[PDB]
Each structure stands twice: as C-alpha cells, then as structure tokens.
Ligand binder design. Structure first.
Ligand SMILES: [Mn+2]
Length: 607
C-alpha cells in the first residue's frame, strides 16, 4: 500500500530509497507524488504546467526556439549565504567560514517547517546522477521538490530520470535531498507565479549527506545538485575518500601540433569561469583550439598513474546572463540561441530576451528603445537613467544543456576524466597582483589559492568561501597532503598559476583587454608546462616577460605589459598584512606550510 500511495514506478527496485521517500512524504504531505522519468515529453509537459501557472512565458519561437522566461519574487533572486548552514556534529568541523548549529537543534527547527509544507502541491521525485551515468566516479542524488521549476532546471543541469534507478539497483546509496518553496496551499487558494517564503534555510548534514532546503525556489538554494551536493557535500566526501570537489571550470586547449592540455581554474567572479572556459582564440592563434569540459564544478581524483583526473559532474550551464555578448563570450551566446530557460532577464518587444551587455552587439552599441524588465515594469533608457533600474536582474540566469555549446569538449562526459596539467586561481585586483604568476612549488600555489582576493578586497580562498563543506583550514591541509602524497608516488604535480585580468593603469582603466586575449596568457602556461617558456623569478613566483608572450594580432606595448605584470615590494608588504588578517579570521588553525610560505615571501621582500 505504501509504494502504491507513492506512485512508485516498477523500475524503482531500491527499498531504502522507497522507505526514505515514504518518510519524507509522511512529513511533507504533498497532495500527490510524481516520479520524474527525465523524458523530453515530461519536460515539455512540466514546461507547459509552468506556462499555465504563469511562472513561465514561452519566448517567440522564431527568435528563441523552445525557450522560456521566468521571473521570480524580488525577495528570492539569489543564493542566501546567511541562511546556509553546515550542521556537522562538532562546530569545529564547520569552521569560521560556515554557519553552524548543533544538528539536533536544527532538526527541531526544520521539522515544523517541513511538516505539511507540500500540502496542496505535487512532490516531484527528481533522481539524478552527478557525473556520467553508471560511471564508477558518479554519485546519485534524489531531490524531492514541490517546484516544477526545479524539476525542469534539474533536467538540464544533471543527468536526470529513470536511468538512475538502473545504476542504483536494489542496494545502491544516494545523497538525500529535500526541497520546498515553503508555501502550502489551502483548498481553492490561488497560487502565485513564484511561490517562496521569507523564511529560508539551506541546511547540510555532512555525517548523513542530507540536504534540506526551505523557502527559496531560486538557483543555488533549490537546484540542489549544483552547490549543495556537488560542492558542500561532495567536498566532505572527498576529504574522507581522497579526492577534491572544487569550484573550477575545466577546459581543454590544443596547440597547432595537436598536443592537448587540460586546465582547471577557480575565479571568484574574475573573468567569469564561463568566459574563460569557452574562450575563443584570437588573431595570432591559428591552429589552436579551446574546448569546454565544464564551467563551474570539478571533481578531481588522483589515479594510479600519478595524474589528477577531473570530471564535470554537471550536465548543463546555470550561468549569469548580464555581461554576455558576442565579444565577451560568443560560444555562450550561441549556446543560448534556443532550448534555454531564462530567469529574471528582460523581454523585448518582439518576444525575445535582453540583458545588460547585449547592446555591445547592436549597431552603434545602442540600447533598446523599450523592454519589459524582470519585475514586469516598462523599461526605457530614460527610465533607467531616472530610476536606476536594470532591465535584467544582476543575478539573472540562463539554464542550457552542455551539448548546446559549439566548443563542448569531446570528453565532456567521459567517465575516465581528463588529466589536469595546471590549476589557475584568479581574482579581481586593481593593484598588486600580476597578470600571471607561476608558483614555484605546490605549497606556494596552495598559498596563492588560500589568499586569493577580489575587489575593498574580499578574500575568497579557492573561490570556495560560500561552498566549503567543512573547516576551511582542514581543506587547505587536504590540498597540501594530496600534493605530498602524489609527489611521493613520483608524480609530476600540475603547475599552479594566479591570474589577474583587472590591473588598472594610471588612468584608472583596465590595461589588459581580457576575454579572447587571455589566450596569450594561457599559451604561456602551456609553454611552461612543456618546459619551453621563459620567465622572471620574483618575490612571489615566476612571471613572463613581455618577450615571452605571443603578441601577433594585438597592439599591446611593453609598458602596458609591465604595468600589469611587474611586482612592487611596498605593495606586497601591504598585501601580506591583509593575509595576516585573513589568517587571524581563520583562527590560526592553519597549516604550518602556509606560515612558512608567508615567511619566505617576507624574506624575499626584505632581501
Ligand atoms: Mn559557481
């Protein structure tokens, strides 16, 4: 009778899973339970349900085929870090970068909120694989959600549906995820187009891998595979099992001889992982190609051959729309030509979408005369001047399948992963940090990643500040020990670089053109990996000289280059003071190796 009241499909053979779904249905009390099979027809039917509710508007089929626009409640527009918790058994295993609560107290807080939360709604059972299906390195999650928006976005972002239960079999384990918009409906009550609750919780219980999300229907709060599972829970699993879950793009780069390298790169917002992961080689780089394995999350495991192998556990892109155009990211623009869900962007008079930055592709770079903004209001360039209103919300999004990307790498879903030749850690700094620096050693590269900041300078170690599943200082130790254990196997460790696209010149403008021209920095990294690139040893590492880069096709002078690449001792003395402040905030439980690196920089500054 239980299984019959859950509408359990015949292909679900896993008794532990069914028992858990039954417990959550008993708690949440949905009116009906629907198991998502992941079919295209199911996706279309759910999209139609969203249209019928007013959550979606279907975009013009001649402008933007099979695409939809959703606009959210203005209270529910982004991840809410202050409402996100790591509820480890001990507070020290959440650490200073995480919000903590004793698990039993949090369970007592969440039980009355989830009791009956889905009254008047359908519970969607969303099975998904993070990583290629059936693979030895993939992990299965099940998200229960009362939002059809979550179901359709999860279809794009993960490997979702019936095929999961063949991999789960009768006894396979899974990450249990529960999500509610926190808006139960009474009989005859008219629903809103974007149900949500002012009260929000996004809770992780690491010891049981549970994720509970209440009150938001948006993005990283509600699509639980992306951040909650693939970074917060997965980082915990990696620490116990010897692998890494990182906030990194993964790209392949092939030179004209056909030699292929892979790079994993973490940016806090610098560049945009999305821009760099889909980089188009500029003039001077005929015969080179750049391909995308992923644009956001990397799972990385050492193999017996002494190499680090990365996979992208996601299946689509959930990208920030504003700023995207054919100059900053043509592969992304081409990706969103159709089959895309857009959230909180603007609506044009011909039933297409618009966002700030798209005018860069228009004749004269002219803004549109009129739009409907993401709040449903009339928008014009005059109105924008008078109210300051942006047409698209700054955190507005596109959701699109990886296979829409013309630069998708052939191995993007290869379960064996790709060997990482270099890590890159970015950051937006007007001063101090060179365009590119190679770390002299693994430990010094870890120091660079641990101390990376973005502009006042906010520190975001490894770009993981909002996403660490356990104590940040223990995570630094995990990186150091992984490198040590690999080097002890004889392995050659990946190079580590820091980049900075955002040094300002004496006129306050960015000197480095960026976007496709970042290929010229990537090509120096490749030369270094091959042992053919030259560089200047300085206080913090090795940086190219002007003559070490390929300038074919770009008018960029030696003085411009030295303006963004030279190091200054006064600036780095001030920078080390800021590192000291960060280390105090991390309560000095830091690995001794980070202290030794700081001391060695200080010695070079005083020599
Ligand atoms: Mn991200």
């Amino acid at each position: 009778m239980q299984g019959n009241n859950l509408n359990t499909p015949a292909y679900v053979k896993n008794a532990k899973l069914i028992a858990w779904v039954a417990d959550m249905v008993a708690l949440c009390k949905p009116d009906t339970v629907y198991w998502c099979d992941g079919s295209d027809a199911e996706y279309q039917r759910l999209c139609q349900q969203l249209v019928d509710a007013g959550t979606f508007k279907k975009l013009n089929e001649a402008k933007r085929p099979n695409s939809y626009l959703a606009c959210s409640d203005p209270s529910d527009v982004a991840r809410v870090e202050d409402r996100t918790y790591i509820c480890s058994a001990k507070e020290e295993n959440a650490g200073p970068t995480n919000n903590w609560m004793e698990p039993s107290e949090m369970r007592a807080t969440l039980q009355p909120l989830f009791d009956g939360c889905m009254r008047g709604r359908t519970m969607y059972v969303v099975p998904f694989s993070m990583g290629p299906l059936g693979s030895p390195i993939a992990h299965i999650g099940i998200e229960l959600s009362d939002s059809p928006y979550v179901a359709v976005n999860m279809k794009i972002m993960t490997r979702m549906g019936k095929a999961v239960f063949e991999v789960l079999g009768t006894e396979g384990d899974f990450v249990p995820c529960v999500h509610t918009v926190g808006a139960p409906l009474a009989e005859g009550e008219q629903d809103v187009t974007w149900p949500c609750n002012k009260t929000k919780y996004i809770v992780h219980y690491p010891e049981t891998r549970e994720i509970w999300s209440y009150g938001s229907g948006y993005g990283g709060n509600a699509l639980l595979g992306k951040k909650c599972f693939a970074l917060r829970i997965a980082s915990n699993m990696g620490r116990d099992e010897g692998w890494l879950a990182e906030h990194m793009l993964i790209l392949g780069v092939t030179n004209p001889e056909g030699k292929k390298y892979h790079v994993a790169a973490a940016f806090p917002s610098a560049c945009g992982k999305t821009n760099f992961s889909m980089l188009v080689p500029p003039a001077g780089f005929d015969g080179w190609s750049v391909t995308t394995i992923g644009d956001d999350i990397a799972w990385i495991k050492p193999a017996a051959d002494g190499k680090l192998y990365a996979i992208n556990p996601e299946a689509g892109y959930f990208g920030v729309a504003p700023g995207t155009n054919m100059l900053t990211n043509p592969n992304c623009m081409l990706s969103v030509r159709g089959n895309t869900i857009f959230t909180n962007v603007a609506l044009t008079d011909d039933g297409d979408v618009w966002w700030e930055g798209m005018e860069q592709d228009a004749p004269g770079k002219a803004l549109p005369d009129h739009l409907i903004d993401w709040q449903g209001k009339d928008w014009t360039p005059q109105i924008a001047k008078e109210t300051g209103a942006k047409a698209a919300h700054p955190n507005s999004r596109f959701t699109v399948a990886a296979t829409n990307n013309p630069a998708l790498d052939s191995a993007w879903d290869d379960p064996k992963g790709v060997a990482i030749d270099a890590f890159i850690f970015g950051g937006r700094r007007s001063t101090t940090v060179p365009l590119v620096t190679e770390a002299r050693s693994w430990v010094e590269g870890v120091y660079m990643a641990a101390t990376m900041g973005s502009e006042v300078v906010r520190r975001d170690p490894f770009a993981m500040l909002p996403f660490m599943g356990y104590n940040m200082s223990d995570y630094f130790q995990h990186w150091l020990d992984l490198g040590k254990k690999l080097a002890a196997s004889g392995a050659t460790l990946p190079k580590i670089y820091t980049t900075n696209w955002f040094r300002k010149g004496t006129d306050g403008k960015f000197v480095w053109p960026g976007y496709g021209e970042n290929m010229r920095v990537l090509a120096w990294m490749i030369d270094r990996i091959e042992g053919k690139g030259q560089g200047e040893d300085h206080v913090t590492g090795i940086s190219p000289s002007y003559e070490d880069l390929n300038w074919t096709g770009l008018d960029f002078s030696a003085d411009q280059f030295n303006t963004v690449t030279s190091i200054d001792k006064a600036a780095w003395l001030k920078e080390l003071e800021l590192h000291a402040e960060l280390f105090k905030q991390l309560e000095h439980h830091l690995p001794k190796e980070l202290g030794e690196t700081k001391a060695e920089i200080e010695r070079r500054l005083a020599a």
